[PDB]
Design a binder for this molecule. Structure first.
Ligand SMILES: Nc1ncnc2c1ncn2[C@@H]1O[C@H](COP(=O)(O)OP(=O)(O)OP(O)(O)=S)[C@@H](O)[C@H]1O
Ligand SMILES: Nc1ncnc2c1ncn2[C@@H]1O[C@H](COP(=O)(O)OP(=O)(O)OP(O)(O)=S)[C@@H](O)[C@H]1O
Ligand SMILES: Nc1ncnc2c1ncn2[C@@H]1O[C@H](COP(=O)(O)OP(=O)(O)OP(O)(O)=S)[C@@H](O)[C@H]1O
Ligand SMILES: Nc1ncnc2c1ncn2[C@@H]1O[C@H](COP(=O)(O)OP(=O)(O)OP(O)(O)=S)[C@@H](O)[C@H]1O
Lengths: 82, 620, 248, 81, 85
């Protein structure tokens, strides 16, 4: 959580410049487990649109890992690539 | 001094009257005492489900010691309550927590037989190390008294796993009180809430806040599931007796908002919204009228309430849980007499079924139906396309004002044994376990919905045996063990059995396809008749109005001739497919010509096309 | 944050906020929890209540009280030693009790309060049942029964408030109120005949998501695209040129 | 029939609306629903449909307000309150 | 007999006779409240793997701390009557 807070703070300190990009973001769900605490610390910043986070995952690891978390899928817009 | 440092006293608090009256529960207090003054094994532990009163009993014992109502060797004991949280805090070195525990244990040892250590949430001692086990030696020497309290399952989740500990305690069972004992506890606790706020509390209120929170809130336990209603009603009444009461605090904030809308909508340089403004003004005025009238009535009442009566509790039970249990405030009782003529605006005929569906709603608003059974559950059956699914959707809209808000499951998929786990959850330890049931998890919250099973006879005759305990008892248990209650829903089953016999084949097929103990549980098993040539003009105008409302998003309202309507209600009639042929005929006849005329220019928007009868077809 | 005018206007939902108030102002066990599907507006209600306090529409039992937004993530940041997190949380709780109820702690995503342990989020259980700290929480409907209802000793100290999704007529009004905040950020204008369409249209096509949220995205995207078009050339004049500069 | 009517009275004793049923009425009831294929549940169904329907029709149409006792009597087919 | 239930026997017959009201009446005058009867329905136990529903699931699985459903009611305060619907 310390490292995550540091990275989030340094993304926020910039004037909205940085555009983060998480490839295969279906791995962000259970980031640090022990009891749900980690991987959803960014959930307050997604809504306000502070960090931008363009990500990309395959079509059936999006409803096996994320769609099971309907509170976080809400913050993402899908771009279907046929 | 470590006792002064970490823990906090309890008798010192009792001496200053900082604790509440402890009405009742004398048997368990005596049991606690006689276990506490025993030779060996003088360690009682309170066990019971949460809310029944377990800290209350130790508070009562504290009051008792302070007043002096105890046997001999319990005078001036000074009950003390540990605090493990503050004990392990800032102890970031290797030998600090155990050292502090040593100091506390020694200070408890030095006092011969005065101190009574008291731990709430006893189970939180099994860890606490990185230890928390330097207590078995002391308990082996009877030096500690250690009155404890936990719940029923954290016991076997954190203590019974260490049966070296579970031996050193004697369990005392704390069962939840009944409604009478609840009334008793409230009659003693009333005085403190009357003081915190500034209101009065009748005794009918202290009766209702117990007899009501027992029939409706079937998830919590008596002594506080019955106090919370009172402690909310008091605060609501305080708010009211301050600035303007509610039901004026809604029309004010609503009229203001409508005003803010209309004074910025008018400056739209458009024509489309010009008809969306010709209604905002109307409703704003029609609400200004009501606000004026009610604010005036306020003067009559102020010239010509001040206590939480019996029905404010019911209002709280309704705000919670959504179930309407009020007093029929003279505006609903008109809807309940116009129910039939209001349903008849969407269904036609089948009055023998409309009267039966509707009668079971006033029968529960007047508080006359049985309180432990569904609010009414009966099955529709008749030929195809007659109305027996439109009626359920018309009833689920008259009650909630949105057709989409009914729990509906299609029984044409539950065709095998194992697909019962689709609506009940999965047994412990299996794949989909965190997901619970599918019929359950939508009636465990907001249990006022309407349950609809389409085509019940398409199922497998083993799903029929969950509805056995659903009907006529009103509850079923999902995989998790929880018990949801169906004592406020309206179950509806549709089917198509027989469909060819007058009245004997349908009953014979029902008796051959269902069990006697299943047809015996329902209310009346209604039969739908089948539409008559006369009864289709009243459907034709309905369909045309609906279609006009559809193609009203482009201001393209039709203008239908009476010969046209009569032809339309004479062409599609065949008395074997009900009333869907009429819909398909309206489409094939009108919509095709209209769509070919619409995208070929010449029918640009803001038009009113007429339809009229040509020899066979009907040209626009 | 609400004083400096940093929060969006909250419209409607009178009943929910009045029940939040009359629960937040009782003697003991005075801490509500909003509950409901994701997107229907549950942080909007708390922000509406905060703006309402700053204005002064609230009763006497709540006039002049500040709402603090607790952040459980930034507390377990550096706590590798054996007692530092408990020390921090104890200081916080003592400081909340040290005031006389002039603070209303507001925990968002409170289903994360179960962990923090490794005996944590558990030392709060005494102060809860007495009404010292006024807790306003809001979690979605199905992580409640997954993390909280598993712990019936802790879910007893919460009063549930159900937040059902609005209808089309209400969503239209919410948009009519929120329009002038996008009209500024994007240098454009939005038409009321479009505010009605972004709510009627997004009710028969996008069924996987719930109301207003699935109806504000359309307005925002349309405005952003229109601004793009304003700066550069319009569409269907851009792609025809991009592919021509490739066929060459 | 006596047990059913006693339980029904105990139920609608929460609005103080005690009932008064006649012996021809109890005999009409105990004769009506008897068919030896479903047991006793038809009796509860008939009790509801024949008494509670009318009573709840009137109770929200005024005229039967709290603190009252309405008598029942056999009519040729139904039993008017 | 001291090693056998204090009573265990079955009644059966047509419906609407009282084969449930009898058990309810029995539980009402021994405990003075009818809610004090353990009532489990054998219509939900139509599968083999539903034996672990009233016994609990083995250690190391998902539903483990939840304990059983029939055993966990008779382990604590065994005096009731158990109804097998
Ligand atoms: N006999 C009683 N007299 C007065 N108040 C009571 C009585 N029984 C219960 N209460 C009240 O009901 C609530 C019960 O509080 P507690 O007993 O502390 O909770 P609990 O029963 O210990 O269960 P948990 O696990 O602690 S939540 C408190 O508000 C008590 O004041
Ligand atoms: N009495 C009626 N009043 C109004 N519309 C009706 C009526 N009967 C049928 N309809 C129309 O028929 C359609 C609905 O038919 P349903 O009653 O839902 O079919 P059904 O009764 O479910 O029969 P099945 O066997 O289930 S297909 C809608 O288009 C209704 O407008
Ligand atoms: N009543 C309302 N008035 C104005 N804007 C609203 C209202 N309800 C929702 N919104 C807006 O719609 C969006 C809803 O977002 P939030 O309510 O903050 O998310 P949420 O409803 O809390 O869902 P979760 O559970 O937090 S993921 C935000 O853009 C709000 O500004
Ligand atoms: N001899 C009886 N004594 C008391 N109540 C009776 C008697 N016979 C019928 N009843 C009532 O009629 C209904 C029958 O209840 P049950 O005993 O569940 O029916 P049943 O005899 O069990 O038939 P099944 O197979 O369970 S549907 C209940 O409302 C009983 O109160």
């Amino acid at each position: 959580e310390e490292r995550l807070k540091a990275v989030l703070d340094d993304i926020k300190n910039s004037a909205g410049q940085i555009i983060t990009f998480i490839d295969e973001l279906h791995t962000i769900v259970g980031a640090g487990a022990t009891a749900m605490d980690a991987g959803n610390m960014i959930k307050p910043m997604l809504a306000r649109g502070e960090l931008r986070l363009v990500g990309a995952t395959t079509l059936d690891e999006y409803r096996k890992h994320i769609e099971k978390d309907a509170a976080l899928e809400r913050r993402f817009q899908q771009v279907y690539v046929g | 001094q470590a006792l002064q440092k970490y823990s906090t006293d309890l008798t010192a608090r009792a001496r200053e009257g900082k604790l509440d009256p402890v009405i009742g529960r004398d048997n368990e207090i005596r049991r606690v005492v006689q276990v506490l003054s025993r030779r060996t094994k003088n360690n009682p532990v309170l066990i019971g489900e949460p809310g029944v009163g377990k800290t209350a009993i130790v508070e009562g014992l504290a009051q008792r010691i302070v007043a002096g109502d105890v046997p001999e060797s319990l005078r001036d004991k000074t009950i003390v309550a540990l605090d493990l949280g503050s004990m392990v805090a800032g102890s970031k070195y290797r030998g600090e927590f155990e050292e502090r525990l040593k100091a506390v244990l020694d200070d408890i040892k030095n006092s011969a037989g005065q101190i009574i250590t008291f731990i709430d949430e006893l189970h939180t001692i099994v860890g606490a190390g990185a230890a928390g086990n330097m207590i078995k030696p002391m308990l082996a020497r009877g030096e500690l008294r250690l009155v404890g309290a936990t719940t029923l399952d954290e016991y076997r989740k954190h203590i019974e796993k260490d049966a070296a500990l579970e031996r050193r305690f004697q369990q005392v069972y704390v069962g939840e009180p009944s409604v009478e004992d609840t009334i008793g506890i409230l009659r003693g606790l009333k005085d403190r809430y009357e003081v915190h706020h500034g209101v009065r509390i009748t005794d009918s209120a202290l009766v209702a806040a117990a007899t009501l929170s027992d029939r409706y809130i079937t998830a919590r336990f008596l002594p506080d599931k019955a106090i919370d209603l009172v402690d909310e009603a008091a605060s609501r009444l305080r708010m009211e007796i301050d600035s303007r009461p509610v039901e004026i605090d809604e029309v004010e904030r609503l009229v203001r908002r409508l005003e803010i809308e209309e004074m910025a909508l008018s400056k739209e340089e458009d024509e489309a919204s010009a008809e969306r403004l010709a209604k905002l003004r109307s409703e704003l005025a029609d609400q200004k009228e009501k606000l004026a009238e009610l604010t005036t009535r306020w003067q009559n009442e102020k010239n010509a309430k001040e206590e939480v009566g019996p029905d404010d509790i019911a209002d709280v039970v309704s705000a919670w849980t959504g179930i309407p249990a009020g007093r029929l405030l003279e505006g609903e009782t008109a809807k309940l007499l116009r129910m039939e003529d209001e349903l008849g605006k969407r269904v036609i005929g089948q009055k023998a079924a409309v009267t039966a569906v509707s009668d079971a709603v006033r029968r529960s608003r007047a508080g006359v139906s049985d309180p432990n059974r569904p609010t009414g559950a009966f099955m529709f059956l008749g030929p195809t396309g007659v109305g027996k699914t439109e009626l359920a959707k018309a009833l689920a809209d008259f009650l909630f004002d949105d057709e989409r808000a009914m729990v509906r499951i299609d029984m044409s998929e539950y065709g095998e044994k194992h697909t019962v786990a689709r609506l009940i959850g999965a047994p412990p330890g299996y794949v989909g376990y965190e997901a619970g049931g599918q019929l359950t998890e939508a009636v465990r919250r907001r249990p006022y919905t309407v349950v609809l099973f389409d085509e019940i006879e398409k199922a497998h005759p083993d799903v029929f045996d969950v509805l056995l305990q659903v009907l006529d008892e009103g509850r079923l248990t999902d995989g998790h063990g929880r018990t949801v209650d169906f004592r406020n829903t309206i179950l509806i089953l549709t089917s198509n059995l027989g469909s060819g016999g007058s009245a004997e084949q349908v009953l014979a097929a029902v008796r051959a396809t269902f069990k006697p103990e299943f047809i015996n549980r329902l209310d009346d098993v209604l039969i739908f008749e089948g539409l008559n040539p006369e009864e289709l003009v009243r459907i034709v105008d309905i369909q045309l109005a609906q279609l006009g409302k559809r193609l009203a998003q482009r201001r393209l309202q039709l203008q239908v001739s009476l010969p046209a309507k009569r032809w339309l209600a004479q062409r599609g009639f065949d008395p074997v497919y009900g009333a869907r042929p009429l819909r398909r005929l309206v489409q094939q006849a009108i919509g095709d010509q209209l769509a070919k005329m619409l995208l070929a220019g010449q029918v640009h928007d803001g038009d009113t096309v007429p339809v009229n009868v040509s020899p066979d077809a009907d040209s626009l | 944050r609400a004083r400096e005018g940093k929060l969006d206007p909250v419209i409607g939902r009178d009943n929910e906020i009045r029940r939040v108030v009359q629960v937040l102002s009782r003697r003991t066990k005075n801490n509500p929890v909003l509950i409901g599907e994701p997107g229907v507006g549950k942080t909007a209600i708390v922000e509406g209540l905060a703006q309402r306090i700053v204005a002064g529409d609230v009763p006497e039992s709540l006039r002049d009280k500040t709402i603090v937004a607790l952040d459980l993530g930034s507390m377990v940041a550096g706590s590798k030693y054996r007692g530092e997190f408990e020390e921090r949380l104890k200081a916080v709780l003592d400081d909340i009790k040290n005031s006389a109820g002039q603070i209303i702690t507001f925990i968002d995503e409170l289903h994360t309060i179960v962990g923090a342990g490794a005996d944590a989020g558990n030392m709060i259980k005494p102060m809860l049942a007495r009404g010292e700290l006024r807790l306003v929480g809001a979690t979605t409907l199905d992580e409640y029964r997954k993390h909280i209802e598993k712990d019936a000793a802790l879910e007893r100290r919460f009063q549930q408030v159900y937040v059902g999704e609005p209808s089309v007529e209400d969503t239209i009004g919410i948009l009519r109120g929120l329009k002038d905040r996008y009209e500024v950020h994007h240098g454009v204008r939005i038409t009321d005949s479009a505010l009605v369409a972004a709510a009627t249209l997004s009710d028969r096509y996008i069924t996987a998501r719930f109301l207003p949220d699935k109806a504000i995205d359309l307005v925002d995207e349309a405005a952003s695209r229109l601004r793009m078009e304003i700066d550069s050339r319009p569409v269907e004049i851009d792609e025809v040129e991009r592919l021509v500069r490739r066929l060459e």
